């Protein structure tokens, strides 16, 4: 009786095509939740083309780094660090 989990494997373009909100360094996304959530997906971008993400997914892990408690701009750094791919672990429900 709680969410279910998925993996998003994204290749960087000229970005990943999605936005995040919340976390400890910023304003929450949900009433009583300092987690890092997907605020929106860019139509036509890398992420929309993969169809793996979804507005409202909690981000738990970015390339192995547990961000359930990380500051907003720390994950922002993790999401834009030059690397061939970005693996995301996500919670949906």
């Amino acid at each position: 009786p709680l969410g279910s989990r998925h993996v998003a494997c994204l290749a960087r373009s000229e970005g990943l095509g999605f936005s995040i909100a919340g976390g400890k360094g910023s304003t929450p996304y949900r009433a009583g939740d300092a987690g890092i959530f997907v605020s929106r997906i860019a139509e036509g971008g890398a992420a929309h083309r993969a169809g793996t993400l979804q507005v409202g997914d909690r981000v738990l892990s970015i390339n192995g780094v547990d961000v359930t408690e990380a500051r907003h701009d720390h994950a922002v750094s993790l999401l834009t660090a030059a690397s061939p791919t970005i693996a995301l672990l996500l919670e949906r429900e």
Binding site: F18, S19, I20, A21, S26, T27, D73, L79
Partner: peptide
């Protein structure tokens, strides 16, 4: 800025 785009 509340969201960040990546």
């Amino acid at each position: 800025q509340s969201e960040t785009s990546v």
